[PDB]
Design a protein around this nucleic acid. Sequence first.
DNA 1: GTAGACTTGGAC
DNA 2: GTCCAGTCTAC
Length: 259
Amino acid sequence: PELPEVETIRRTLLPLIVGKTIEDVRIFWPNIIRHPRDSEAFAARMIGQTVRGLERRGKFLKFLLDRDALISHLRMEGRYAVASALEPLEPHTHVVFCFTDGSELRYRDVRKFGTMHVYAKEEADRRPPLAELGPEPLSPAFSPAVLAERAVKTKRSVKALLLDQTVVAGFGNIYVDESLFRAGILPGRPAASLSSKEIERLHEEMVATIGEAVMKGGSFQHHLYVYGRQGNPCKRCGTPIEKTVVAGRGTHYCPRCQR
DNA sequence: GTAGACTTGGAC
DNA sequence: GTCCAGTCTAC
Ligand SMILES: [Zn+2]
């Protein structure tokens, strides 16, 4: 889940939990709990608090309670669902929040990579993992200048720069590949080699790509140009789409539209 | 920077 | 059976 999917989860989940009061917290896989370290303390402190809201920062979900904020990162496969506490749980359910009205918020995660941090609302933004995140892509804080400032000061590929949550937050493998294609830039090239003209266009395609994705509720998979299409013809020039590895990850691109 | 880990299931 | 799918930490 990248920014578009997490934003979709946020909008759907909020009306289902706002106003509900936590009666119990059950944890079946302790390692997901990062702070406080003791999973027993994590559970005890939330009991009695009511859900006041749900926000998003980068790829993180921020559950706003009475005094605390629960910061959740879904990583690769984490997922949330609301259901009746009288029914049996689905496989791979690792954390459950039971509400006083008989309902519950279930957290599933097959690979167990997700993390959960709890801090007082006022400390959240100044403590890890939210402290060092870059600006939100769909806000005035993200501008060509910001990208250029970070770009012209590193030898790594442009794709590595965009995957760095401290440069800009919310972009993942799918939308980095799609944005680079639309801007017409090869992923594996030095970020320092990009021109003012290139950086500006990229900034523009990034904003437009992530914006459209949210409106379509995320993967919008019918609107992908390169991700997952290795071997198939380019939708604009017809050249077969290629796949290699860059920044330690699968990377898709068109050798003709991208330079 | 391209790995090395954490950890489970589906494709071929 | 072997290859593929967002951070942290490390040769
Ligand atoms: Zn093309």
